[PDB]
């Protein structure tokens, strides 16, 4: 995460190492944890947490990629295998349905595993408590990648409401607000929340706030992709005006 010059500072650091040498005790455990917990603001702790989060993120991305490769290979192998008992069309339809079931189950399993890895990475990055080090470009890049991967996996597992806080955190990193897929995901998730409030006869304030959020983010996604004063933008304005 961070790569770890004044003569006075060098002298201070030398005297600190000299002090630490006198009180060398590998078996020391601080009864009061506050001074030890000050290490969470150090560079070494930040680098270790960054590396742990990176390892978890690579594990999740690898899981997704291996699932895609496995699905491609399974389709190819099933296509290249001889079927000497298959002579009707409905048998081929049934075989295709069975293959689709297998592929779907494998995809969901892999998505669940990758989401576990992404959640572990999120937790690892969460415990970096230095505001200065959280502003580094590398931290922002890794955080955006982890948030994006978690959002897509969670959406694929049909857990739409859980994506909203992560998407809102995402659109505040750098210029991530300018990306239209984030707003498309937000519009879908807010639509799900509004439909849930509608079907459960929940409070009207919740319904109105969810509908307003969905309309705002749908309009923003339409503007970001097709541009202002476009046929798509005019159509979306018409839909929003009719809905509200």
């Amino acid at each position: 995460l961070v790569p770890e010059l004044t003569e006075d500072q060098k002298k201070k650091k030398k005297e600190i190492m000299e002090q630490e040498s006198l009180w060398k005790n590998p078996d020391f455990k601080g009864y009061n944890k506050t001074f030890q917990e000050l290490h969470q603001l150090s560079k070494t702790f930040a680098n270790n947490q960054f590396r742990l989060a990176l390892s978890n993120y690579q594990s999740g991305v690898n899981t997704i990629m291996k699932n895609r490769d496995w699905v491609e290979q399974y389709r190819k192998e099933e296509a290249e295998k001889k079927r000497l008992d298959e002579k009707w069309y409905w048998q081929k339809v049934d075989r295709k349905a069975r293959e689709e079931r297998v592929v779907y189950r494998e995809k969901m399993k892999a998505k669940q595993d990758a989401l576990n890895y992404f959640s572990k990475a999120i937790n690892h990055l969460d415990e970096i408590k230095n505001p200065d080090l959280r502003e580094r470009p590398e931290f922002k890049r890794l955080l955006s990648d982890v948030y994006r991967s978690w959002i897509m996996a969670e959406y694929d597992l049909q857990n739409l409401p859980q994506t909203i806080p992560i998407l809102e955190l995402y659109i505040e990193i750098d210029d991530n607000e300018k990306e239209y897929p984030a707003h498309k995901y937000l519009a879908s998730a807010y639509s799900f929340e509004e439909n849930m409030i509608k079907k459960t006869k929940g409070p009207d304030d919740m319904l109105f706030k969810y509908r307003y959020k969905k309309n705002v983010h749908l309009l923003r996604a339409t503007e970001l992709k097709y541009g202002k004063d476009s046929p798509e933008y005019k159509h979306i304005v018409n839909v929003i005006n009719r809905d509200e």
């Binding site: 989401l115 576990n116 959640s119 572990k120």
Partner: protein, 281 residues
């Protein structure tokens, strides 16, 4: 004859003193019921007897420790009985929910009970206790423990055995994600089908844990019986060394009592002896 001193009287008194001391020692053995009452009687016998007395007091205490240990193990296996019946109930609900004749509302009504049963599993795990000590949370597990449970089942320094109890909540049973904290759902026929396999694994983990505790319990029963056997043998050994035989000791008391009377009579005779020559003046 000599009158200034009486040699016969000195001999009779000297014998009387020895007999009287021996009489006191016989009284002490008869009044207390112990063959050795002072270190001067038999030093090695007193040493071995007191060591066996430490062993005897230890063997009852060690036996009492073993019964208390069996109470803990029995208490733990009582809690797991309720966990097993809840997972069996969830397992039979999953079979019903997997049938295709049901709609979304019926499956949600099944999930309503599922949520309560999962919460009851978690409550059992959290609140199971022996003497204000939690048992099913994982503190005594083999991997990453926060505590160790040792039963001291002997009368000496290092005679202790270890017992492990593993985590028995929903996360440990495979019924809840330990990172996301979401648990099983029967609200869909496809998910209900997957739960049938998950319940089987959970029942397998509970069944293995009950078999472990049953093994610990059976072992402590064998040790408790041996501890009772060892105490009986040690007390027999200590009794033979330390306790006096009343019948044999009463014979010794009567011999010395008669000896004291005979010497007393002779002392009286010796004192009158010198008066014989007084008639010569």
């Amino acid at each position: 004859m000599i009158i200034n001193h009486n040699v016969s009287a000195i001999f009779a008194h000297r014998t009387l003193k020895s007999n009287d001391a021996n009489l006191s020692k016989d009284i002490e053995k008869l009044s207390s019921g112990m063959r050795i009452n002072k270190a001067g009687d038999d030093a090695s016998g007193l040493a071995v007897s007191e060591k066996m007395r430490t062993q005897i007091a230890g063997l009852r205490r060690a036996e009492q420790n073993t019964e208390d240990g069996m109470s803990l193990i029995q208490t733990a296996e009582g809690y797991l009985q309720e966990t097993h019946e809840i997972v069996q109930r969830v397992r039979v609900l999953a079979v019903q929910a997997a049938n295709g004749i049901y709609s979304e509302e019926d499956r949600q009504q099944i999930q309503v009970e599922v949520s309560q049963l999962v919460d009851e599993i978690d409550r059992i795990a959290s609140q199971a206790e022996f003497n204000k000590m939690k048992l099913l949370t994982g503190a005594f597990a083999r991997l990453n423990p926060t505590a160790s449970m040792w039963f001291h089942i002997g009368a000496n320094m290092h005679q202790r055995e270890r017992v492990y109890i593993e985590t028995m909540n929903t996360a440990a049973l495979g019924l809840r994600n330990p990172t996301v904290l979401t648990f099983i759902s029967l609200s869909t026929a496809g998910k209900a089908n997957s739960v049938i396999g998950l319940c089987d694994d959970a029942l397998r983990v509970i069944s293995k844990q009950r078999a472990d505790l049953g093994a610990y319990y059976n072992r402590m029963e064998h040790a408790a019986k041996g501890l009772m056997n060892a105490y009986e043998n040690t007390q027999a050994s200590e009794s033979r060394i330390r306790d006096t035989d009343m019948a044999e000791q009463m014979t010794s008391f009567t011999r010395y009592q008669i000896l004291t009377q005979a010497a007393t009579s002779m002392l009286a005779q010796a004192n009158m002896k010198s008066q014989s020559v007084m008639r010569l003046l």
